Write a protein that binds this DNA or RNA. Structure first.
Lengths: 146, 148, 149, 148
DNA sequence: ATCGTCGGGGAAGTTTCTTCCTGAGTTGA
DNA sequence: TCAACTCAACTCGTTTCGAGTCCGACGAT
């Protein structure tokens, strides 16, 4: 069970998948944009223990945002536990910054439907800038490169 | 009631382990040591903090610009959902910048150690670089003073 | 009366040396000089002020939040021995903006020097900044004008 | 040589006049007084300093917060001519508490006052207050120890 | 003194300002 | 990590990493 997280005080988001390795049996369990402003450490632990994951995928950031403190908190929380937290270098923000639309809507409209069967169920009531894109793209890139 | 107060730092981290007798207000020094968190610092932090299975972990607050902050949240996440509360206390000595901070720390240490360990000479004779174990001891003792 | 009026300051101190006739009430400008007190100011003050051993030394009142006050009190102690009266006058040019003092000072200086030196041009060329020698000249001349009563 | 140590202040200035026998290290206290510099402080200062013709005058350095600095520079200009060495020493007891600054001062005072005058009758019966003449005497004695 | 505004290290000698020297961030390799 | 370079207050949640406060210097009356 794979859990990919877009970290940030802006709009944190997480996606929970189950991927059968090398078998191309992808199952999307959930995708959500949460809020980590009220009791953020308690809220982070509560959101991470919902569907106890085996791997957590994060985007590495510099000093740009306090979201790094969430990265180190997550590393400490799941350290001895069975899960393994891995922080991937930022693909995101390479050269230009006006390249979201293409990859976001393309990968969504192409690949969300075959895994959850609730494509438009989330589309009709979710709309945000750079949370579902970062989280889903990190998770899907890890799974495709897996 | 096992107290573990830590002076944080990647180069010279230090920790003091006290025993506070509940309802008796009895301070008994269990141990005081310093370690190194250079190679795979997460393993070293976890081991040094779980060494004596404490009930409270005391850390000293740093500003928003230091690697010591990264250790703070790792420890907070590590001991979260446990019967071991990590608390981040303000800097005990917050007066003089350099000449008063370290010297006042090691002075109050050398003066207040005698009533707690009964092994004063053996600890003073080893290190001679006291300004980390001194900070940890002062942090722990300040937390205990704030207990009553 | 050999009179020495001083515009005080570490960076560019200045002084004007006059001769005042006691029974004629006539002004005579002897000299006007800039100096430097940026290094060893007590030695420099003692040297520059005793250069033309005066009978009166006039200083301009300074506030307490300036090094000119310590120079004032050093001079007070120095000449408190004999033969030299140190007198501290209120700033002659007073009021309005601070820069209005400088321009008014150098203006009255430029327009009133000709009647005293006959070497007006040598002073305008050497030491082009005029806002210290003006202060010293105006201080001395104001004291001597206030001497009649 | 005749040594004159001054506790400066418009509040209650004080001075101690010692006589040091040259090459014998014999300290003899000539006088101790609490003067007043209220009206025409320059005249009063000059009178009090020229009362006993000294060879050195010892002052305690002050911060630029009080007219005592103007008195210091007045003294420097006054004795600058010749014959005198005005020395401005920092306040001797540069340590511990401020409330203990007077305690140790008057302690060293009461410790060493008896051995210097041999006419301590009028002086013992004279005054019930110390916290100015004590400071002046301690400054003077510190210079006397720093003399050899 | 008094209201508005600003900066926030220590020690010693060239002394009440200047000239240093600390010892911790912080920053690119 | 690490070695050169730059530069000095505290501090509380401000639902606990950054935006808030406090306390002595100047400037101009």
């Amino acid at each position: 069970i794979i859990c990919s997280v877009d970290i940030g005080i802006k709009n944190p988001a997480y996606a929970i998948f189950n991927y059968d390795n090398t078998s191309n049996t992808i199952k999307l369990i959930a995708i959500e944009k949460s809020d980590w402003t009220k009791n953020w450490e308690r809220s982070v632990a509560r959101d991470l223990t919902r569907y106890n994951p085996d791997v957590v995928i994060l985007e590495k950031q510099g000093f740009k945002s306090p979201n790094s403190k969430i990265i180190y908190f997550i590393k400490g929380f799941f350290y001895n536990s069975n899960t393994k937290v891995i922080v991937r270098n930022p693909t995101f923000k390479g050269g230009s910054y006006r390249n979201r639309k293409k990859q976001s809507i393309d990968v969504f409209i192409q690949k969300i439907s075959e895994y959850t069967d609730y494509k438009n169920d989330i589309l009709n009531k979710y709309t945000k800038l750079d949370d579902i894109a970062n989280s889903f793209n990190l998770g899907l890139s890890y799974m495709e490169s897996l």
